[PDB]
Design a protein around this ligand. Sequence first.
Ligand SMILES: [Mg+2]
Ligand SMILES: [Mg+2]
Ligand SMILES: [Mg+2]
Ligand SMILES: [Mg+2]
Ligand SMILES: [Mg+2]
Ligand SMILES: [Mg+2]
Ligand SMILES: [Mg+2]
Ligand SMILES: [Mg+2]
Ligand SMILES: [Mg+2]
Ligand SMILES: [Mg+2]
Ligand SMILES: [Mg+2]
Ligand SMILES: [Mg+2]
Ligand SMILES: [Mg+2]
Ligand SMILES: [Mg+2]
Ligand SMILES: [Mg+2]
Ligand SMILES: [Mg+2]
Ligand SMILES: [Mg+2]
Ligand SMILES: [Mg+2]
Ligand SMILES: [Mg+2]
Ligand SMILES: [Mg+2]
Ligand SMILES: [Mg+2]
Ligand SMILES: [Mg+2]
Ligand SMILES: [Mg+2]
Ligand SMILES: [Mg+2]
Ligand SMILES: [Mg+2]
Ligand SMILES: [Mg+2]
Ligand SMILES: [Mg+2]
Ligand SMILES: [Mg+2]
Ligand SMILES: [Mg+2]
Ligand SMILES: [Mg+2]
Ligand SMILES: [Mg+2]
Ligand SMILES: [Mg+2]
Ligand SMILES: [Mg+2]
Ligand SMILES: [Mg+2]
Ligand SMILES: [Mg+2]
Ligand SMILES: [Mg+2]
Ligand SMILES: [Mg+2]
Ligand SMILES: [Mg+2]
Ligand SMILES: [Mg+2]
Ligand SMILES: [Mg+2]
Ligand SMILES: [Mg+2]
Ligand SMILES: [Mg+2]
Ligand SMILES: [Mg+2]
Ligand SMILES: [Mg+2]
Ligand SMILES: [Mg+2]
Ligand SMILES: [Mg+2]
Ligand SMILES: [Mg+2]
Ligand SMILES: [Mg+2]
Ligand SMILES: [Mg+2]
Ligand SMILES: [Mg+2]
Ligand SMILES: [Mg+2]
Ligand SMILES: [Mg+2]
Ligand SMILES: [Mg+2]
Ligand SMILES: [Mg+2]
Ligand SMILES: [Mg+2]
Ligand SMILES: [Mg+2]
Ligand SMILES: [Mg+2]
Ligand SMILES: [Mg+2]
Ligand SMILES: [Mg+2]
Ligand SMILES: [Mg+2]
Ligand SMILES: [Mg+2]
Ligand SMILES: [Mg+2]
Ligand SMILES: [Mg+2]
Ligand SMILES: [Mg+2]
Ligand SMILES: [Mg+2]
Ligand SMILES: [Mg+2]
Ligand SMILES: [Mg+2]
Ligand SMILES: [Mg+2]
Ligand SMILES: [Mg+2]
Ligand SMILES: [Mg+2]
Ligand SMILES: [Mg+2]
Ligand SMILES: [Mg+2]
Ligand SMILES: [Mg+2]
Ligand SMILES: [Mg+2]
Ligand SMILES: [Mg+2]
Ligand SMILES: [Mg+2]
Ligand SMILES: [Mg+2]
Ligand SMILES: [Mg+2]
Ligand SMILES: [Mg+2]
Ligand SMILES: [Mg+2]
Ligand SMILES: [Mg+2]
Ligand SMILES: [Mg+2]
Ligand SMILES: [Mg+2]
Ligand SMILES: [Mg+2]
Ligand SMILES: [Mg+2]
Ligand SMILES: [Mg+2]
Ligand SMILES: [Mg+2]
Ligand SMILES: [Mg+2]
Ligand SMILES: [Mg+2]
Ligand SMILES: [Mg+2]
Ligand SMILES: [Mg+2]
Ligand SMILES: [Mg+2]
Ligand SMILES: [Mg+2]
Ligand SMILES: [Mg+2]
Ligand SMILES: [Mg+2]
Ligand SMILES: [Mg+2]
Ligand SMILES: [Mg+2]
Ligand SMILES: [Mg+2]
Ligand SMILES: [Mg+2]
Ligand SMILES: [Mg+2]
Ligand SMILES: [Mg+2]
Ligand SMILES: [Mg+2]
Ligand SMILES: [Mg+2]
Ligand SMILES: [Mg+2]
Ligand SMILES: [Mg+2]
Ligand SMILES: [Mg+2]
Ligand SMILES: [Mg+2]
Ligand SMILES: [Mg+2]
Ligand SMILES: [Mg+2]
Ligand SMILES: [Mg+2]
Ligand SMILES: [Mg+2]
Ligand SMILES: [Mg+2]
Ligand SMILES: [Mg+2]
Ligand SMILES: [Mg+2]
Ligand SMILES: [Mg+2]
Ligand SMILES: [Mg+2]
Ligand SMILES: [Mg+2]
Ligand SMILES: [Mg+2]
Ligand SMILES: [Mg+2]
Ligand SMILES: [Mg+2]
Ligand SMILES: [Mg+2]
Ligand SMILES: [Mg+2]
Ligand SMILES: [Mg+2]
Ligand SMILES: [Mg+2]
Ligand SMILES: [Mg+2]
Ligand SMILES: [Mg+2]
Ligand SMILES: [Mg+2]
Ligand SMILES: [Mg+2]
Ligand SMILES: [Mg+2]
Ligand SMILES: [Mg+2]
Ligand SMILES: [Mg+2]
Ligand SMILES: [Mg+2]
Ligand SMILES: [Mg+2]
Ligand SMILES: [Mg+2]
Ligand SMILES: [Mg+2]
Ligand SMILES: [Mg+2]
Ligand SMILES: [Mg+2]
Ligand SMILES: [Mg+2]
Ligand SMILES: [Mg+2]
Ligand SMILES: [Mg+2]
Ligand SMILES: [Mg+2]
Ligand SMILES: [Mg+2]
Ligand SMILES: [Mg+2]
Ligand SMILES: [Mg+2]
Ligand SMILES: [Mg+2]
Ligand SMILES: [Mg+2]
Ligand SMILES: [Mg+2]
Ligand SMILES: [Mg+2]
Ligand SMILES: [Mg+2]
Ligand SMILES: [Mg+2]
Ligand SMILES: [Mg+2]
Ligand SMILES: [Mg+2]
Ligand SMILES: [Mg+2]
Ligand SMILES: [Mg+2]
Ligand SMILES: [Mg+2]
Ligand SMILES: [Mg+2]
Ligand SMILES: [Mg+2]
Ligand SMILES: [Mg+2]
Ligand SMILES: [Mg+2]
Ligand SMILES: [Mg+2]
Ligand SMILES: [Mg+2]
Ligand SMILES: [Mg+2]
Ligand SMILES: [Mg+2]
Ligand SMILES: [Mg+2]
Ligand SMILES: [Mg+2]
Ligand SMILES: [Mg+2]
Ligand SMILES: [Mg+2]
Ligand SMILES: [Mg+2]
Ligand SMILES: [Mg+2]
Ligand SMILES: [Mg+2]
Ligand SMILES: [Mg+2]
Ligand SMILES: [Mg+2]
Ligand SMILES: [Mg+2]
Ligand SMILES: [Mg+2]
Ligand SMILES: [Mg+2]
Ligand SMILES: [Mg+2]
Ligand SMILES: [Mg+2]
Ligand SMILES: [Mg+2]
Ligand SMILES: [Mg+2]
Ligand SMILES: [Mg+2]
Ligand SMILES: [Mg+2]
Ligand SMILES: [Mg+2]
Ligand SMILES: [Mg+2]
Ligand SMILES: [Mg+2]
Ligand SMILES: [Mg+2]
Ligand SMILES: [Mg+2]
Ligand SMILES: [Mg+2]
Ligand SMILES: [Mg+2]
Ligand SMILES: [Mg+2]
Ligand SMILES: [Mg+2]
Ligand SMILES: [Mg+2]
Ligand SMILES: [Mg+2]
Ligand SMILES: [Mg+2]
Ligand SMILES: [Mg+2]
Ligand SMILES: [Mg+2]
Ligand SMILES: [Mg+2]
Ligand SMILES: [Mg+2]
Ligand SMILES: [Mg+2]
Ligand SMILES: [Mg+2]
Ligand SMILES: [Mg+2]
Ligand SMILES: [Mg+2]
Lengths: 138, 124
Amino acid sequence: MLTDPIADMLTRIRNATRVYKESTDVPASRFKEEILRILAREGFIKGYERVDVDGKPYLRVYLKYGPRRQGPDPRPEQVIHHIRRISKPGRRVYVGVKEIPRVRRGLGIAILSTSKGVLTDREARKLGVGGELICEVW
Amino acid sequence: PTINQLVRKGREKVRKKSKVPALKGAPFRRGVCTVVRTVTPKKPNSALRKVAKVRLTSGYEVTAYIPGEGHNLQEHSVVLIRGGRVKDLLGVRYHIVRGVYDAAGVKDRKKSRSKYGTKKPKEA
RNA sequence: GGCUAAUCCCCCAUGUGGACCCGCCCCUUGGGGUGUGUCCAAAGGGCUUUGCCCGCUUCCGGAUGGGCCCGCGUCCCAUCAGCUAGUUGGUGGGGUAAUGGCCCACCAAGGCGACGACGGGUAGCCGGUCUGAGAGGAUGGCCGGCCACAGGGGCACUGAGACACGGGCCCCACUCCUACGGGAGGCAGCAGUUAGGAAUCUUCCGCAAUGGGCGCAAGCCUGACGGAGCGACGCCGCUUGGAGGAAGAAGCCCUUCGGGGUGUAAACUCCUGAACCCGGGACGAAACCCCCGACGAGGGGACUGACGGUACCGGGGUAAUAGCGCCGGCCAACUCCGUGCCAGCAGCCGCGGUAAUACGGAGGGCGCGAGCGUUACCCGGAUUCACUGGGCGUAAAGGGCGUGUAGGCGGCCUGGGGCGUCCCAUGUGAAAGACCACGGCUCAACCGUGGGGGAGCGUGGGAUACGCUCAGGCUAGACGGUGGGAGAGGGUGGUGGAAUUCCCGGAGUAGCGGUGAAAUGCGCAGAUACCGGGAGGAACGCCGAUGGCGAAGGCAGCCACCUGGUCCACCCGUGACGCUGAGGCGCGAAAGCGUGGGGAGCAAACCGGAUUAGAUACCCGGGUAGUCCACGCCCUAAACGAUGCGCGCUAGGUCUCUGGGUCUCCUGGGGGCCGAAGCUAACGCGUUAAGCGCGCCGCCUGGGGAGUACGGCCGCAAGGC
RNA sequence: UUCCCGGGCCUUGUACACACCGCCCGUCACGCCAUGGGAGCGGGCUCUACCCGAAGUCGCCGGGAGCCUACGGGCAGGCGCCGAGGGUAGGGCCCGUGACUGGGGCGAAGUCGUAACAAGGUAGCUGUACCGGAAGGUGCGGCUGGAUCCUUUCU
Ligand SMILES: [Mg+2]
Ligand SMILES: [Mg+2]
Ligand SMILES: [Mg+2]
Ligand SMILES: [Mg+2]
Ligand SMILES: [Mg+2]
Ligand SMILES: [Mg+2]
Ligand SMILES: [Mg+2]
Ligand SMILES: [Mg+2]
Ligand SMILES: [Mg+2]
Ligand SMILES: [Mg+2]
Ligand SMILES: [Mg+2]
Ligand SMILES: [Mg+2]
Ligand SMILES: [Mg+2]
Ligand SMILES: [Mg+2]
Ligand SMILES: [Mg+2]
Ligand SMILES: [Mg+2]
Ligand SMILES: [Mg+2]
Ligand SMILES: [Mg+2]
Ligand SMILES: [Mg+2]
Ligand SMILES: [Mg+2]
Ligand SMILES: [Mg+2]
Ligand SMILES: [Mg+2]
Ligand SMILES: [Mg+2]
Ligand SMILES: [Mg+2]
Ligand SMILES: [Mg+2]
Ligand SMILES: [Mg+2]
Ligand SMILES: [Mg+2]
Ligand SMILES: [Mg+2]
Ligand SMILES: [Mg+2]
Ligand SMILES: [Mg+2]
Ligand SMILES: [Mg+2]
Ligand SMILES: [Mg+2]
Ligand SMILES: [Mg+2]
Ligand SMILES: [Mg+2]
Ligand SMILES: [Mg+2]
Ligand SMILES: [Mg+2]
Ligand SMILES: [Mg+2]
Ligand SMILES: [Mg+2]
Ligand SMILES: [Mg+2]
Ligand SMILES: [Mg+2]
Ligand SMILES: [Mg+2]
Ligand SMILES: [Mg+2]
Ligand SMILES: [Mg+2]
Ligand SMILES: [Mg+2]
Ligand SMILES: [Mg+2]
Ligand SMILES: [Mg+2]
Ligand SMILES: [Mg+2]
Ligand SMILES: [Mg+2]
Ligand SMILES: [Mg+2]
Ligand SMILES: [Mg+2]
Ligand SMILES: [Mg+2]
Ligand SMILES: [Mg+2]
Ligand SMILES: [Mg+2]
Ligand SMILES: [Mg+2]
Ligand SMILES: [Mg+2]
Ligand SMILES: [Mg+2]
Ligand SMILES: [Mg+2]
Ligand SMILES: [Mg+2]
Ligand SMILES: [Mg+2]
Ligand SMILES: [Mg+2]
Ligand SMILES: [Mg+2]
Ligand SMILES: [Mg+2]
Ligand SMILES: [Mg+2]
Ligand SMILES: [Mg+2]
Ligand SMILES: [Mg+2]
Ligand SMILES: [Mg+2]
Ligand SMILES: [Mg+2]
Ligand SMILES: [Mg+2]
Ligand SMILES: [Mg+2]
Ligand SMILES: [Mg+2]
Ligand SMILES: [Mg+2]
Ligand SMILES: [Mg+2]
Ligand SMILES: [Mg+2]
Ligand SMILES: [Mg+2]
Ligand SMILES: [Mg+2]
Ligand SMILES: [Mg+2]
Ligand SMILES: [Mg+2]
Ligand SMILES: [Mg+2]
Ligand SMILES: [Mg+2]
Ligand SMILES: [Mg+2]
Ligand SMILES: [Mg+2]
Ligand SMILES: [Mg+2]
Ligand SMILES: [Mg+2]
Ligand SMILES: [Mg+2]
Ligand SMILES: [Mg+2]
Ligand SMILES: [Mg+2]
Ligand SMILES: [Mg+2]
Ligand SMILES: [Mg+2]
Ligand SMILES: [Mg+2]
Ligand SMILES: [Mg+2]
Ligand SMILES: [Mg+2]
Ligand SMILES: [Mg+2]
Ligand SMILES: [Mg+2]
Ligand SMILES: [Mg+2]
Ligand SMILES: [Mg+2]
Ligand SMILES: [Mg+2]
Ligand SMILES: [Mg+2]
Ligand SMILES: [Mg+2]
Ligand SMILES: [Mg+2]
Ligand SMILES: [Mg+2]
Ligand SMILES: [Mg+2]
Ligand SMILES: [Mg+2]
Ligand SMILES: [Mg+2]
Ligand SMILES: [Mg+2]
Ligand SMILES: [Mg+2]
Ligand SMILES: [Mg+2]
Ligand SMILES: [Mg+2]
Ligand SMILES: [Mg+2]
Ligand SMILES: [Mg+2]
Ligand SMILES: [Mg+2]
Ligand SMILES: [Mg+2]
Ligand SMILES: [Mg+2]
Ligand SMILES: [Mg+2]
Ligand SMILES: [Mg+2]
Ligand SMILES: [Mg+2]
Ligand SMILES: [Mg+2]
Ligand SMILES: [Mg+2]
Ligand SMILES: [Mg+2]
Ligand SMILES: [Mg+2]
Ligand SMILES: [Mg+2]
Ligand SMILES: [Mg+2]
Ligand SMILES: [Mg+2]
Ligand SMILES: [Mg+2]
Ligand SMILES: [Mg+2]
Ligand SMILES: [Mg+2]
Ligand SMILES: [Mg+2]
Ligand SMILES: [Mg+2]
Ligand SMILES: [Mg+2]
Ligand SMILES: [Mg+2]
Ligand SMILES: [Mg+2]
Ligand SMILES: [Mg+2]
Ligand SMILES: [Mg+2]
Ligand SMILES: [Mg+2]
Ligand SMILES: [Mg+2]
Ligand SMILES: [Mg+2]
Ligand SMILES: [Mg+2]
Ligand SMILES: [Mg+2]
Ligand SMILES: [Mg+2]
Ligand SMILES: [Mg+2]
Ligand SMILES: [Mg+2]
Ligand SMILES: [Mg+2]
Ligand SMILES: [Mg+2]
Ligand SMILES: [Mg+2]
Ligand SMILES: [Mg+2]
Ligand SMILES: [Mg+2]
Ligand SMILES: [Mg+2]
Ligand SMILES: [Mg+2]
Ligand SMILES: [Mg+2]
Ligand SMILES: [Mg+2]
Ligand SMILES: [Mg+2]
Ligand SMILES: [Mg+2]
Ligand SMILES: [Mg+2]
Ligand SMILES: [Mg+2]
Ligand SMILES: [Mg+2]
Ligand SMILES: [Mg+2]
Ligand SMILES: [Mg+2]
Ligand SMILES: [Mg+2]
Ligand SMILES: [Mg+2]
Ligand SMILES: [Mg+2]
Ligand SMILES: [Mg+2]
Ligand SMILES: [Mg+2]
Ligand SMILES: [Mg+2]
Ligand SMILES: [Mg+2]
Ligand SMILES: [Mg+2]
Ligand SMILES: [Mg+2]
Ligand SMILES: [Mg+2]
Ligand SMILES: [Mg+2]
Ligand SMILES: [Mg+2]
Ligand SMILES: [Mg+2]
Ligand SMILES: [Mg+2]
Ligand SMILES: [Mg+2]
Ligand SMILES: [Mg+2]
Ligand SMILES: [Mg+2]
Ligand SMILES: [Mg+2]
Ligand SMILES: [Mg+2]
Ligand SMILES: [Mg+2]
Ligand SMILES: [Mg+2]
Ligand SMILES: [Mg+2]
Ligand SMILES: [Mg+2]
Ligand SMILES: [Mg+2]
Ligand SMILES: [Mg+2]
Ligand SMILES: [Mg+2]
Ligand SMILES: [Mg+2]
Ligand SMILES: [Mg+2]
Ligand SMILES: [Mg+2]
Ligand SMILES: [Mg+2]
Ligand SMILES: [Mg+2]
Ligand SMILES: [Mg+2]
Ligand SMILES: [Mg+2]
Ligand SMILES: [Mg+2]
Ligand SMILES: [Mg+2]
Ligand SMILES: [Mg+2]
Ligand SMILES: [Mg+2]
Ligand SMILES: [Mg+2]
Ligand SMILES: [Mg+2]
Ligand SMILES: [Mg+2]
Ligand SMILES: [Mg+2]
Ligand SMILES: [Mg+2]
Ligand SMILES: [Mg+2]
Ligand SMILES: [Mg+2]
Ligand SMILES: [Mg+2]
């Protein structure tokens, strides 16, 4: 099957961006949609789209990079420098409000899934909820 | 390993053996020379090394090394064992503490004297 | 044997009340209420003596202290895998303050265990302590809490309470008394002795304080306790001096013989004034008691200090102990003699075999200082058990392969619930400790007061994104229908030619074979070389491949049956049916085993011929098991891609096997080579990953000892795990 | 230009690097040393069956078998269950001891060969089997972690 939907999302993005692709289809979910909404508003993807490929629902994820590097290796600086899953099917991670990490000196974020819904560490913290810690981004 | 492996079996704390049974956990143990003599060292080194097989309050009969420049020990001297070993000859897990029980201290030693157990000398 | 008193023991009454059987009321496990019968009380003593005090009695509460019971937590070994007869439950009963097989009688046949039962080993738990960035690890001396013990084992009695450390009984061991009959003990209370050990204190003062027993009070008892003593055992404070003082003394070390060093260090000069002497001298102690009031509230009065003539205060006063480890690199600190693989050092690299910063002494230096070294033990480093935070192609490490059991994991949409999860309130989280703040000892250590934090569990309330679960629905995963494939995939019957050997026959003449050379061997009983026939066994040239199938092992002539897997088309059906898999079970090259067959070539062992110093070998001649079949065992391997399975994502190019295709080419599924990104220690890998990710299983943790010993299991054995 | 000697350049294999006069494996003997394996012997704990069984609580008798008595009953005392513990016979643990005894170290590389590493001079390795003074040979499979396309040891 696909054992983590989400991981595989994050990954698609990762190998996508590493190879500098202008964007990518990922197979569609209300949740995976939340996550990219957050991921987007928060600066990391150009934005995304709800597409249909071969009669099946996909989300296109458009993809942003920084400008052209000089010298040898002109490959431009990544925006999504790193993205990684935290909670994993059969090993879960749930955090108090006092336990919500904070990321790369605040230069990145966490994504939490709460009963206030999906939100960033900062958002949770001001909201005052905890939840499953989905992912590290920075 | 997976997680479900760590829950299933899970990691193994591993313990360490002792480099010595002075037993007791004792810091030192009293003994009696059974025999005393001189041995040849190991690998690159030549020497005549000074040592005494000693019988113990801990019940075992061991080989200990008599440190420093002269010594006084013979058939049944009685002596104290501290342990710490000698790499260059083998079977010696322990040193004799000089200056205790029937073992003298090394006399004339000016230089490092707590080890070797010699009293501080006076002058004018 | 005999008198005798009481707050000792009885009997009768009173019954506020309580107890018990039966009935009903409310309530919900044996909680209350009530009626009927029954059963149950008591003790005096003192005075300021007719009313007060200390007591007794029955009931109902409080308070404090406990019993008992449940959830959860709570070390190593699976080389401990099964355990259980009061065992597990039931009815009745014994018993107890109370539940309960706690025990007992009779019924039932259960209880427990890989979520580790039973067995073995070890150990008192905890608040806390040590270490660590943390997570963890390690620990449970002192102080508080809880448990257990009181020479070893049983037992009960009295009692509110014990199955009682200075109470009782019996057995045992030991010691002591003994008229040998029989008796007496129990320091794991404080001191102290002895033994053991590397090692652990005074047979001290006091009952002033605090605390406990009894007492109306006075008081009495208190090795609890307050104090003192001894040990650098620790921690903290303090001292062995402060300012001057040479271009820089002697001695001593080094020397390129000019000078360098110890070193402002000394000497000396001038202040101060540890020790010590004199004087004065605590707080810790104010109640119990007594007086007025009312034995209350309140007020007044009296006594009492082990520590101690100590703390502290004032006066006087002397220049007044320094040591230990290090100086090759880790590591701060160098030179001269001595020594010559010796004597010695050594934590590890390693030093010493005549120029040793590494041994030993010297001068000098570095580090700490009433201490400094050492050995021992814990945590650290050690991300070297890796939750944070490792790995497995060659470094240690992927099981030989497969099937699935337990178990772990789980696509897309909607609704219910709200277990996980998140939040809020609240209760608990004793004190001590840690943290912060002020404060008390001249500081500090040590001590007080306050504040803060807290995981965790109980309770109430709330949220529903993710996990679960229940209900519905969908089709991208999985499977199924239809259609089209290819293939040494497997089992059984079958047949076909080539060659080897042997038998038969023909012709046919002296050698063939073999090697580096040769001998052995076979040949005139006519071999080799040739033709014809026959028998028999095994294996399948060419096609054939840098091909194909299969899970691995492995599988090649041809035909027939039996039968597994698999790929592509069509988008037809089901509707998440999915992945993985401990254990289990089944396969499993060769050699090997058992019983029966078979036996042409080949061939361990063997038997000979060579070679060689020898030749238990490589070369030659021969040959047995075995190789082949059948049934049954065996279960290993460089069982190799030395690379577990599944799923998804990430340039290409070229070669190839097999499908479909509007057929330069496109589109699936295999096999190969080069290579983008990226990974790797490198070599290499690279859409057939060793890249980026998720699930699940196996496995590793220096080399040797050793795949040995031991135990268990398997096997006929060899031997396997 | 094949060979002998020395040499240059490219390449290849190495387990050599005081570098092929390098490296290395196995067997023996007598000392001597710790270790480990181990019958029998002595000790300890435990479990099962059987028998003897103190103290004590509980049961039951408590009798023209004793003492008190309101004759209701009590007490002495007696018998039984259980029971610390012992005894006899068996399993299992653990300790001490121990004849006999496998591998390791040094005595001294001492010996006999030359097994492996270079095509190690017959490629090596492997499971298994038989042989053999010893490394070993050899047979059958299998792997490549295999050079390049007479025999002749040891420093
Ligand atoms: Mg929480
Ligand atoms: Mg890990
Ligand atoms: Mg040397
Ligand atoms: Mg003597
Ligand atoms: Mg040491
Ligand atoms: Mg001394
Ligand atoms: Mg030294
Ligand atoms: Mg009388
Ligand atoms: Mg009444
Ligand atoms: Mg009544
Ligand atoms: Mg009455
Ligand atoms: Mg009374
Ligand atoms: Mg009250
Ligand atoms: Mg109460
Ligand atoms: Mg209570
Ligand atoms: Mg209670
Ligand atoms: Mg019964
Ligand atoms: Mg029984
Ligand atoms: Mg009952
Ligand atoms: Mg049963
Ligand atoms: Mg413990
Ligand atoms: Mg214990
Ligand atoms: Mg700390
Ligand atoms: Mg750690
Ligand atoms: Mg901790
Ligand atoms: Mg503990
Ligand atoms: Mg103690
Ligand atoms: Mg305590
Ligand atoms: Mg308690
Ligand atoms: Mg006891
Ligand atoms: Mg007790
Ligand atoms: Mg005693
Ligand atoms: Mg007892
Ligand atoms: Mg009483
Ligand atoms: Mg009682
Ligand atoms: Mg008692
Ligand atoms: Mg006592
Ligand atoms: Mg007695
Ligand atoms: Mg004592
Ligand atoms: Mg002694
Ligand atoms: Mg004391
Ligand atoms: Mg006294
Ligand atoms: Mg008092
Ligand atoms: Mg008092
Ligand atoms: Mg009183
Ligand atoms: Mg009075
Ligand atoms: Mg007394
Ligand atoms: Mg005291
Ligand atoms: Mg002392
Ligand atoms: Mg001392
Ligand atoms: Mg001490
Ligand atoms: Mg001078
Ligand atoms: Mg001078
Ligand atoms: Mg001065
Ligand atoms: Mg002056
Ligand atoms: Mg003065
Ligand atoms: Mg006076
Ligand atoms: Mg006072
Ligand atoms: Mg006062
Ligand atoms: Mg009093
Ligand atoms: Mg008083
Ligand atoms: Mg009055
Ligand atoms: Mg009065
Ligand atoms: Mg008063
Ligand atoms: Mg007063
Ligand atoms: Mg006095
Ligand atoms: Mg005085
Ligand atoms: Mg003064
Ligand atoms: Mg003065
Ligand atoms: Mg002076
Ligand atoms: Mg002076
Ligand atoms: Mg240091
Ligand atoms: Mg240095
Ligand atoms: Mg000498
Ligand atoms: Mg000289
Ligand atoms: Mg020399
Ligand atoms: Mg010299
Ligand atoms: Mg030299
Ligand atoms: Mg030196
Ligand atoms: Mg040194
Ligand atoms: Mg020196
Ligand atoms: Mg010095
Ligand atoms: Mg100090
Ligand atoms: Mg110290
Ligand atoms: Mg350590
Ligand atoms: Mg660390
Ligand atoms: Mg590692
Ligand atoms: Mg792996
Ligand atoms: Mg290797
Ligand atoms: Mg390996
Ligand atoms: Mg494999
Ligand atoms: Mg293997
Ligand atoms: Mg498997
Ligand atoms: Mg499977
Ligand atoms: Mg399942
Ligand atoms: Mg889901
Ligand atoms: Mg819902
Ligand atoms: Mg919930
Ligand atoms: Mg609701
Ligand atoms: Mg509490
Ligand atoms: Mg606290
Ligand atoms: Mg804190
Ligand atoms: Mg202060
Ligand atoms: Mg404090
Ligand atoms: Mg607090
Ligand atoms: Mg709090
Ligand atoms: Mg805390
Ligand atoms: Mg806490
Ligand atoms: Mg709470
Ligand atoms: Mg809702
Ligand atoms: Mg599930
Ligand atoms: Mg459904
Ligand atoms: Mg159709
Ligand atoms: Mg078909
Ligand atoms: Mg067709
Ligand atoms: Mg077919
Ligand atoms: Mg076939
Ligand atoms: Mg076929
Ligand atoms: Mg076939
Ligand atoms: Mg024939
Ligand atoms: Mg013929
Ligand atoms: Mg003829
Ligand atoms: Mg001839
Ligand atoms: Mg022949
Ligand atoms: Mg022949
Ligand atoms: Mg002939
Ligand atoms: Mg002949
Ligand atoms: Mg003739
Ligand atoms: Mg013939
Ligand atoms: Mg003949
Ligand atoms: Mg003829
Ligand atoms: Mg012929
Ligand atoms: Mg023919
Ligand atoms: Mg035949
Ligand atoms: Mg034929
Ligand atoms: Mg192939
Ligand atoms: Mg194969
Ligand atoms: Mg078929
Ligand atoms: Mg098919
Ligand atoms: Mg359809
Ligand atoms: Mg359909
Ligand atoms: Mg449908
Ligand atoms: Mg399996
Ligand atoms: Mg097989
Ligand atoms: Mg075979
Ligand atoms: Mg056979
Ligand atoms: Mg046969
Ligand atoms: Mg032959
Ligand atoms: Mg031969
Ligand atoms: Mg030769
Ligand atoms: Mg010969
Ligand atoms: Mg042959
Ligand atoms: Mg046979
Ligand atoms: Mg055989
Ligand atoms: Mg597997
Ligand atoms: Mg076609
Ligand atoms: Mg392909
Ligand atoms: Mg690259
Ligand atoms: Mg990686
Ligand atoms: Mg490549
Ligand atoms: Mg992959
Ligand atoms: Mg790798
Ligand atoms: Mg390791
Ligand atoms: Mg080892
Ligand atoms: Mg083996
Ligand atoms: Mg064993
Ligand atoms: Mg065995
Ligand atoms: Mg057997
Ligand atoms: Mg074998
Ligand atoms: Mg196996
Ligand atoms: Mg195996
Ligand atoms: Mg040449
Ligand atoms: Mg040239
Ligand atoms: Mg090389
Ligand atoms: Mg040679
Ligand atoms: Mg030796
Ligand atoms: Mg032994
Ligand atoms: Mg032995
Ligand atoms: Mg015995
Ligand atoms: Mg009996
Ligand atoms: Mg009578
Ligand atoms: Mg009677
Ligand atoms: Mg009875
Ligand atoms: Mg009995
Ligand atoms: Mg018994
Ligand atoms: Mg033993
Ligand atoms: Mg030997
Ligand atoms: Mg060795
Ligand atoms: Mg040797
Ligand atoms: Mg060979
Ligand atoms: Mg070999
Ligand atoms: Mg060789
Ligand atoms: Mg060879
Ligand atoms: Mg050959
Ligand atoms: Mg072989
Ligand atoms: Mg042979
Ligand atoms: Mg072969
Ligand atoms: Mg090879
Ligand atoms: Mg080849
Ligand atoms: Mg050649
Ligand atoms: Mg030799």
